[PDB]
């Protein structure tokens, strides 16, 4: 619709679960905010999935994240609002890229797999 | 878009959300000060 670049854009039903899981991971010290930290997590091989917004001003400053996710075999999905993603990150400022990171013994593991399966279903 | 208020219990436009949270909890003692 608004952004054809938003290939990984999720629908209303899925974005609620995305934001809720992002907030839960933030509560578990499991979330990284910003495109730079998402890139760092992808390089380090610690992120299991990456979310980003579809309303970045250039939209090319988070467009390398899909390529790096394909390189590192990490699912990625887009949302339609940066402000809501930032709020789900616990940050007043808008966030256009967030990463959820692997932890040992985390209790969010099952929700992580569920959201990854849904993200993979969105692609293609 | 429209969003529910976590501070007022009302529906607000998505574009005013940031300002709505910024000034919906402006401490009245700031106005007194």
């Amino acid at each position: 619709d608004v952004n054809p670049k938003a290939y990984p854009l999720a629908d209303a039903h899925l974005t609620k679960k995305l934001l809720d899981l992002v907030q839960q991971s933030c509560n578990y010290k499991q979330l990284r905010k910003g495109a730079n930290e998402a890139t760092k997590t992808l390089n380090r091989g610690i992120s299991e999935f990456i979310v980003m917004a579809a309303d970045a001003e250039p939209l090319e400053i988070i467009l390398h994240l899909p390529l790096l996710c394909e390189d590192k075999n990490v699912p990625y999905v887009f949302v339609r609002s940066k402000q809501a993603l930032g709020r789900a990150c616990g940050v007043s400022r808008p966030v256009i890229a967030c990463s959820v990171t692997i932890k040992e013994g985390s209790q969010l593991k099952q929700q992580i797999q569920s959201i990854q399966q849904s993200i993979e279903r969105l692609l293609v | 878009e429209y969003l529910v208020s976590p501070i007022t219990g009302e529906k607000i436009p998505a574009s005013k959300m940031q300002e709505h949270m910024r000034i919906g909890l402006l401490d009245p003692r700031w106005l007194e000060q």
């Binding site: 609620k16 789900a88 | 949270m21």
Partner: peptide
């Protein structure tokens, strides 16, 4: 959808409600 007020914002809301009471 719903929105999540941040931790500082929660602290401000709780403090304001307590001061009001």
């Amino acid at each position: 959808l719903g929105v999540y007020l941040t931790k500082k914002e929660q602290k401000k809301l709780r403090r304001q409600t307590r001061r009001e009471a």
